[PDB]
C-alpha cells in the first residue's frame, strides 16, 4: 500500500564530497587540492584511518600529500569512498585496482577484479596475471590462471606470455602447478 | 566468476556514530550527550543543515539542545541518519514519525507510515488518522481514510471515532468527502 522511496544515503554523501561542505581536511594530488571529511575516509579506509589517528603532526595542517595516484583515478576512488560506486571504473580498472590496493578498499578492489576478468583475452592474459599478483587480487589471479590453462595453446604464442616467462618465472610456476 | 562482496557503507558510517570517532559537535537530549558529525547530519537532514549553516553562534560551542524528542526515539532517528535503517521502528513508529517530521527526514517518515498502516485496526484508525494529519504523512492519511470507509460500520461504534468527531471535525469532513 505505502510506497517507501529509494534510499538516498549514498548520493547525499556524494553531495558532501562534490560541494565540499563541512570539510575538515585537504588532499593534494599532483598540485590539485580536494577538501574531504576525516571521519568518512577513516570509516571507509584503514589506511586513511591510521593516517589521521596516528600520523598527522599539527604542522601538516590536516593536509595529505598524495604521490601514488593519478588525479582522475583518485577522483574515482574518492567517489567510491563516499558513495560505494565507481561509474567510470571500466576506463581505469588497472590503476583503480592499484589505488584500492594502496588504500585498502577491499570491495573496490574486487569491483576492479571483476571488470578486468571480463576483459581477459589471449593477448592480455599474462599482463593481467602480473597485475593481479602485483596487487594481491586473489579472485583475479585465479581467474587469469584458469583462463591461461583453458587457452594455453594460443597464449604461449603471445609476446606477453613470452615476456612474462623471463620477467616473472614464479608465476609460470604457479600456473603449471595448477595441474 | 568474481564474487563482489556486499557494500558496507551504511554499516561503516554506523560505526562512526556508535564509537564516536572524529566527531565535531554534540547533541543533548534530556541531559544525555551524543557526539556526531555535522557534515553527515547536514547532508541527511535539511533541518540540521540549516541549523549548522545559519543558526549556531560560536558561544553554543557546536552544541545542540534537543527538547522535542525522547532519548530512545532520538537514537533510532540518528541510527537512520547514519545508516538508512531503523531496526526498532515497530516499537516506536508514532514518535519516530513525529521526529522524522520535525527533522524533515522524508524516507524515515514514510517507513513509519508503512508500519503504522500495517497496524491499522478498527479500534485505532481514528487515532492513526489524527496522527497522520498532525504530522503531514500523506500516504498514511490516505490509507487510514480508505480503511475507515471500507470499515465504516464498526469504526463509527468506537470511542476513538466518537472522540474524533468532537476533537477534529474537519477530518470527519475529508473522510465523508472521500465519496
Curated annotation (Swiss-Prot), chains A, B:
Residues 9-40, 120-178 are annotated as: Important for homodimerization. Widely expressed. Signal peptide: none annotated. Antigen recognized by serum from scleroderma patient. It is linked to Nabais Sa-de Vries syndrome 1: An autosomal dominant disorder characterized by global developmental delay, impaired intellectual development, speech delay, and variable behavioral abnormalities. Affected individuals show congenital microcephaly and dysmorphic facial features, including round face, small palpebral fissures, highly arched eyebrows, and short nose. Component of a cullin-RING-based BCR (BTB-CUL3-RBX1) E3 ubiquitin-protein ligase complex that mediates the ubiquitination of target proteins, leading most often to their proteasomal degradation. In complex with CUL3, involved in ubiquitination and proteasomal degradation of BRMS1, DAXX, PDX1/IPF1, GLI2 and GLI3. In complex with CUL3, involved in ubiquitination of MACROH2A1 and BMI1; this does not lead to their proteasomal degradation. Inhibits transcriptional activation of PDX1/IPF1 targets, such as insulin, by promoting PDX1/IPF1 degradation. Interacts with GLI2 and GLI3. Homodimer and homooligomer. Heterodimer with SPOPL. Each dimer interacts with two CUL3 molecules. Part of cullin-RING-based BCR (BTB-CUL3-RBX1) E3 ubiquitin-protein ligase complexes that contain CUL3 and homodimeric SPOP, or the heterodimer formed by SPOP and SPOPL, plus a target protein, such as MACROH2A1, PDX1/IPF1, BMI1, BRMS1 and DAXX. Interacts with IRF1; this interaction mediates IRF1 proteasomal degradation. Interacts with HNF1A. This is Speckle-type POZ protein. It comes from Homo sapiens. The chain holds residues 178 to 356 of 374 of the full protein.
Amino acid at each position: 500500500m505505502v510506497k517507501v522511496p529509494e534510499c538516498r544515503l549514498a548520493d547525499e554523501l556524494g553531495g558532501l564530497w562534490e560541494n565540499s561542505r563541512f570539510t575538515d581536511c585537504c588532499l593534494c594530488v599532483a598540485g590539485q587540492e580536494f577538501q574531504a571529511h576525516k571521519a568518512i575516509l577513516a570509516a571507509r579506509s584503514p589506511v586513511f584511518s591510521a593516517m589521521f589517528e596516528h600520523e598527522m603532526e599539527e604542522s601538516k595542517k590536516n593536509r595529505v600529500e598524495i604521490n601514488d595516484v593519478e588525479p582522475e583515478v583518485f577522483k574515482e576512488m574518492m567517489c567510491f569512498i563516499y558513495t560505494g560506486k565507481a561509474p567510470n571504473l571500466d576506463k581505469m580498472a588497472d590503476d583503480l585496482l592499484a589505488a584500492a590496493d594502496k588504500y585498502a578498499l577491499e570491495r573496490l578492489k574486487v569491483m576492479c577484479e571483476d571488470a578486468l576478468c571480463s576483459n581477459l583475452s589471449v593477448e592480455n592474459a599474462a599482463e593481467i596475471l602480473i597485475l593481479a599478483d602485483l596487487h594481491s587480487a586473489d579472485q583475479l589471479k585465479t581467474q587469469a590462471v584458469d583462463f591461461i590453462n583453458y587457452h594455453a595453446s594460443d597464449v604461449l604464442e603471445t609476446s606477453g606470455w613470452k615476456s612474462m616467462v623471463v620477467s616473472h618465472p614464479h608465476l609460470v610456476a604457479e600456473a603449471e602447478r595448477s595441474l
